[PDB]
Amino acid sequence: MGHIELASPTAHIWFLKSLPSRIGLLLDMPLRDIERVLYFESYVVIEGGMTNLERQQILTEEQYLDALEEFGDEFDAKMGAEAIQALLKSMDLEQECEQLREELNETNSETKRKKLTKRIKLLEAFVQSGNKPEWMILTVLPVLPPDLRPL
Amino acid sequence: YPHTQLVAGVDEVGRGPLVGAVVTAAVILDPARPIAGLNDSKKLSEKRRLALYEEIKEKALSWSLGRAEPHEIDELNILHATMLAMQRAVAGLHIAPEYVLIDGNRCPKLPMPAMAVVKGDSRVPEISAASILAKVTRDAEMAALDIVFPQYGFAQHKGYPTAFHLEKLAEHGATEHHRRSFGPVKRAL
DNA sequence: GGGCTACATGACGGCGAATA
DNA sequence: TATTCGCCGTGTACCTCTCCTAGCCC
RNA sequence: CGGAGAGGUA
């Protein structure tokens, strides 16, 4: 086999549109908004901490304008696959699971419980699985052997 | 809001941990000294959260802390120990509230009227302020216990039953602070 | 001698996660 | 909950005929 | 030695 070095990371379409979107429900973000930050038509705060901006927010071109008016030193905000990969890297797994676990018994809502338990089962299966969340973002592209794609 | 001026918000932390108290706070905010950027304590960065501590405590009309130790949790169970903690928090307020807003879906027995608010921490500034005070206090106690019992790593997992905490609980056994009624702690004992 | 650009619509059903 | 809109897929084995990605200069 | 379009036999 072979490989191709990619300058910029690329999100895998299978995990992007698995229906349900694994990345989308792992980050607890809607499909419409997650599919609007990877195409550079919007913006997103990459684990930034400011007065208003918290960890995750999809700012538009105009919102970024008045965001970057006075401040802009600590809180960062990237855009696209790099930001998504950094978000997947800088999110805890065991801690998030514990929190969700508790909010499972206290919560009385039905639909919420279903959505909560469907999230926690994926989180657990991931934690016993030997995979990493950032591996879902493709960075090196393997190539097929030439004989399997003859000319 | 109720048609009252002295509304207290109340929230809890440390429901699921295997170690230390359940901690609650009660807060009456000052309408003349509003606190900007109150929101669920979990969504806040640690720096911002601790920053609020010097604003909440300064700008609130009244605040207080109520706790329930591991032994009281083992005797009462976690639900009634949370209700007791909450009571103390509300009972510790210098200024008596006219009305109490509690995070979740149950109220403790109180001498004043009270309402349970589901996700009140995200909807009610006073419950958000209580969430921050309770969380910061609790997290500092887990850091203090980590200094005394460094082999458990209490500063990192804040006493929650993480794989690491369960491993260290099996290796070193349960400490006096370790809630003795929780299933993992019963097994280690 | 060298490097160099990448237009469709009659589809019958059902289920499921998305909203109304 | 019912309505909408998405994709899911829609038997099998043979026979004959014809027809398929090109683009920049000292 | 691959892929399309048309027609035909059970």
Curated annotation (Swiss-Prot), chain A:
Q: Quote the PTM field.
A: Acetylated on several lysine residues in the presence of glucose.
> Domain of life, per the record?
Bacteria
Q: How is it used?
A: Co-administration of salinamide and rifampicin or salinamide and myxopyronin suppresses the emergence of resistance to both antibiotics.
Q: How does it assemble?
A: The RNAP catalytic core consists of 2 alpha, 1 beta, 1 beta' and 1 omega subunit. When a sigma factor is associated with the core the holoenzyme is formed, which can initiate transcription. The rRNA transcription and antitermination complex (rrnTAC) consists of RNAP, NusA, NusB, NusE (rpsJ), NusG, SubB, ribosomal protein S4, DNA and precursor rRNA; S4 is more flexible than other subunits.
Purpose: DNA-dependent RNA polymerase (RNAP) catalyzes the transcription of DNA into RNA using the four ribonucleoside triphosphates as substrates. Resistance to the antibiotics salinamide A, salinamide B, rifampicin, streptolydigin, CBR703, myxopyronin, and lipiarmycin can result from mutations in this protein.
Q: Which family does it belong to?
A: Belongs to the RNA polymerase beta' chain family.
Q: What is this protein called?
A: DNA-directed RNA polymerase subunit beta'
Source organism per entry reads Escherichia coli (strain K12)
Intact protein stretch covered? 102 to 252 of 1407
